[PDB]
Amino acid sequence: HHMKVGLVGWRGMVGSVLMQRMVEENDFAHIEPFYFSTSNAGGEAPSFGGKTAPALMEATDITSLKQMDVIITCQGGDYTSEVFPKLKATGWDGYWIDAASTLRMTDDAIIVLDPVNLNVIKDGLAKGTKTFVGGNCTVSLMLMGVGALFQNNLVEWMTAMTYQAASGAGAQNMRELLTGMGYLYNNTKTLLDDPKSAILDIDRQVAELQRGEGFPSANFGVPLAGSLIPYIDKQLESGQSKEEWKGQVETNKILGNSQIVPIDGHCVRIGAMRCHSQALTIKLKKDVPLDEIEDMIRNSNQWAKVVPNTREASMTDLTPVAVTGTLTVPVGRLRKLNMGKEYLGAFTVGDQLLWGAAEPLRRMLRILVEYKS
Amino acid sequence: HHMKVGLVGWRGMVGSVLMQRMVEENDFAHIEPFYFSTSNAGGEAPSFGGKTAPALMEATDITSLKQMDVIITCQGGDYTSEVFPKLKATGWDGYWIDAASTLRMTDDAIIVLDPVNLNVIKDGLAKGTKTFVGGNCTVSLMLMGVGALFQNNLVEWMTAMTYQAASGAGAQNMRELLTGMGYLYNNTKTLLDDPKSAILDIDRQVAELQRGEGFPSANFGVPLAGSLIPYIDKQLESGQSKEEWKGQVETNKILGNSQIVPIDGHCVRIGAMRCHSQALTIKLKKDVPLDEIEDMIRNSNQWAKVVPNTREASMTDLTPVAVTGTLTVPVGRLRKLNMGKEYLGAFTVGDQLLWGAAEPLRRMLRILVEYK
Numbered sequence A: 001h002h003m004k005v006g007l008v009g010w011r012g013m014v015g016s017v018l019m020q021r022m023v024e025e026n027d028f029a030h031i032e033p034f035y036f037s038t039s040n041a042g043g044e045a046p047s048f049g050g051k052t053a054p055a056l057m058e059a060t061d062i063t064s065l066k067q068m069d070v071i072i073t074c075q076g077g078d079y080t081s082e083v084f085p086k087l088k089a090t091g092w093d094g095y096w097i098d099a100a101s102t103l104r105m106t107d108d109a110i111i112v113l114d115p116v117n118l119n120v121i122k123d124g125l126a127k128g129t130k131t132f133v134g135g136n137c138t139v140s141l142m143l144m145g146v147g148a149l150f151q152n153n154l155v156e157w158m159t160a161m162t163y164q165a166a167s168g169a170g171a172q173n174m175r176e177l178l179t180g181m182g183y184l185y186n187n188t189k190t191l192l193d194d195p196k197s198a199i200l201d202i203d204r205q206v207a208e209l210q211r212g213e214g215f216p217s218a219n220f221g222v223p224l225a226g227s228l229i230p231y232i233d234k235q236l237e238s239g240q241s242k243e244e245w246k247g248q249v250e251t252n253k254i255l256g257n258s259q260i261v262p263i264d265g266h267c268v269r270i271g272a273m274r275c276h277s278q279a280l281t282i283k284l285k286k287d288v289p290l291d292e293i294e295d296m297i298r299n300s301n302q303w304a305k306v307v308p309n310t311r312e313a314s315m316t317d318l319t320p321v322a323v324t325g326t327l328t329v330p331v332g333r334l335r336k337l338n339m340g341k342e343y344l345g346a347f348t349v350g351d352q353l354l355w356g357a358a359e360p361l362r363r364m365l366r367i368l369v370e371y372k373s
Numbered sequence B: 001h002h003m004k005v006g007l008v009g010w011r012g013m014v015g016s017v018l019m020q021r022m023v024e025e026n027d028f029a030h031i032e033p034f035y036f037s038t039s040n041a042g043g044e045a046p047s048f049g050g051k052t053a054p055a056l057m058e059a060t061d062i063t064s065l066k067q068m069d070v071i072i073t074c075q076g077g078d079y080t081s082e083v084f085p086k087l088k089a090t091g092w093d094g095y096w097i098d099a100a101s102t103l104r105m106t107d108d109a110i111i112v113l114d115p116v117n118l119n120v121i122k123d124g125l126a127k128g129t130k131t132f133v134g135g136n137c138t139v140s141l142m143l144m145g146v147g148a149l150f151q152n153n154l155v156e157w158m159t160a161m162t163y164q165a166a167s168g169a170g171a172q173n174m175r176e177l178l179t180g181m182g183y184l185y186n187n188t189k190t191l192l193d194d195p196k197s198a199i200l201d202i203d204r205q206v207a208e209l210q211r212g213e214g215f216p217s218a219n220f221g222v223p224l225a226g227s228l229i230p231y232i233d234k235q236l237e238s239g240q241s242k243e244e245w246k247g248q249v250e251t252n253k254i255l256g257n258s259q260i261v262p263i264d265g266h267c268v269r270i271g272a273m274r275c276h277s278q279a280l281t282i283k284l285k286k287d288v289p290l291d292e293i294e295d296m297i298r299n300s301n302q303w304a305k306v307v308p309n310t311r312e313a314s315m316t317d318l319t320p321v322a323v324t325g326t327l328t329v330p331v332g333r334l335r336k337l338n339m340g341k342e343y344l345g346a347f348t349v350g351d352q353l354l355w356g357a358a359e360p361l362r363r364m365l366r367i368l369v370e371y372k
């Protein structure tokens, strides 16, 4: 018996990464897929991975959803907020796998990142937990890299200064970033094409372009191309942004910690497509040798990598260009810092759409399939 | 009388910012300027500020240099290494003001950031110091923002994760960054113009372009447009980069600390033109109320500015777009961090060519004209 799996939000950005990865892993050999839609119910459904499906079903139709053993949705928080309470109200016994943050902090939900917390997931399955949610991209990517330090309870606290890509804000924000790159270059091309032009003239024109009415910044509100934005998501009364607030609460929930490990920092948007990078100050509980720290990271999971702390390796392997569209999570610049042997610096890069979004969800689906077979 | 000032490296990027600032401040009105060249000796000299000067003099000719009361050079470390020892050996009694890092860590030299260490500069001038050197751009910009915390002896240590602009590497690096932005957009433009294009197609195309032979990365070595580079300058034995190593030694020399305050972090290059930003974890020696920390920053100098910790103000005032080409050094996101009330987070942005390069040098020159 293959589980009946309902796919919602398969068409969007996160959903399309999920579909691609499910095809790459032949995930459809092990399930019976049913495709749902909020806009095209009745239309022809995709045939990813060589499996046909009936016509698109209404994503908001509770009776249709109750037919599934598993719902995996990349549709969004507004969808989950409407549909999830109605579906659970029917007594529906199935599993809900969600990319949206809506249910992340509810008592009945487990945040999934199985290379780090498989034990939490399996303990939850045995307890009857039915709802499984991806974590925030910044937390998931950081834990894929240095989570072994937390699992071994070596971390007293951590600050994280991030370099976040436009993909976290959405497909249209990525397109805006690229369009702004073109706006800056194409309107300074006549100066740039002349070797004898003055750099200060080129620079003056770029600043005028960034500051002018013509710059395309509808989605970010301010320019990103050629700049950065040191604020992501809503303002909290504490002065934290909501993006920054997720660090401590989601990290400690993924790990199952009862004693909270403090995590804080600044989440800053930069002009990258879909890789988040993070500069970490990690206070350790003892003077752990650097080679043992590297071994713990290397051995923690398949995807974490240690980049040797050299100029050449850092430039080639520890960048968004090295990582984008891969599942690799490099950790580099690993060094004890000047203020003491217990201060560990680390710099890590991860793809936001994979480990930061779609990949923990398809891996949770395979865990379920194996669990229920 | 009006001192005779020899200007070296006035033609380069830092020199050009310096000349513009001197014209803007009418600095040439109180000096007699003389222009030197490494490539165009004998040619007609510029006339910034409406002041004429004789033909361009040879920048490596010690006999010409000795006639100057001041030498202010933006030419580079290779220049300073060659010329400065030979000039001092002749007994030259003049002042040497330098953008290059060559002399920063010599005992006889003072690192100038007068809104922070004017007292160090005045004491050195009276003690006979004749060599004054601008600090590393990251250190100077950080101190212009949060230097008052150090002057009040409140900092136990600090980590600084930086977001450094292309200007720190050079004019050609800035041009390469813009050219790469155009390369990514123009070769993805057909996809971008179609609303129905799949974002994963657009994204696959950008990554291929960044990774291919056609991407222009001759100067940085790897792409910067749409990326970052977490390594700046030479690799040290400790694993620190030379850029990162500068933080602790330069900060403590600028301040005059005999007790070194530890400073460390990661220096990272991003795709900005000429503003450096820094995300700071500051461990304080005691629990200082946040509003008093703000007042320390406001009171420290007229260019530091406290940006209220709001989404709207951070987005519009605490960015390279807000700061570029100006003398403003905003400090924002000021907040006590989750690991305790002695932990202060801060985010600052500063123009790397002004306070990070040219501005401390022209202010030091005005200090000399006022002093003598």
Ligand SMILES: NC(=O)c1ccc[n+]([C@@H]2O[C@H](COP(=O)([O-])OP(=O)(O)OC[C@H]3O[C@@H](n4cnc5c(N)ncnc54)[C@H](OP(=O)(O)O)[C@@H]3O)[C@@H](O)[C@H]2O)c1
Pocket (backbone or CB within 6 Å): A008, A009, A010, A011, A012, A013, A014, A015, A036, A037, A038, A039, A040, A059, A074, A075, A076, A077, A099, A100, A101, A137, A167, A168, A169, A170, A171, A352, A353, A356, A357
């Ligand atoms: N964006 C991220 O990087 C990211 C990361 C982690 C988690 N998440 C969460 O994942 C959820 C979805 O994010 P997303 O960025 O993937 O959303 P999205 O691209 O905006 O897609 C969401 C839905 O919008 C509809 N849609 C409208 N026009 C579309 C078009 N031209 N192409 C494709 N779909 C279109 C589709 O629904 P129909 O097919 O029913 O019409 C699609 O499933 C949100 O809860 C978000 O918070 C996002």
Ligand SMILES: NC(=O)c1ccc[n+]([C@@H]2O[C@H](COP(=O)([O-])OP(=O)(O)OC[C@H]3O[C@@H](n4cnc5c(N)ncnc54)[C@H](OP(=O)(O)O)[C@@H]3O)[C@@H](O)[C@H]2O)c1
Pocket (backbone or CB within 6 Å): B008, B009, B010, B011, B012, B013, B014, B015, B036, B037, B038, B039, B040, B059, B074, B075, B076, B077, B099, B100, B101, B137, B167, B168, B169, B170, B171, B352, B353, B356, B357
């Ligand atoms: N780059 C920075 O952002 C920065 C920041 C702080 C400190 N500094 C220091 O300042 C020094 C110079 O930096 P820079 O970036 O200003 O150097 P630069 O633009 O390369 O200029 C240095 C010299 O190169 C010569 N040159 C060759 N081709 C040139 C051209 N097309 N246009 C203009 N000059 C040209 C000029 O000397 P001639 O007139 O004699 O031919 C010029 O004065 C170095 O010591 C550097 O470490 C730089």
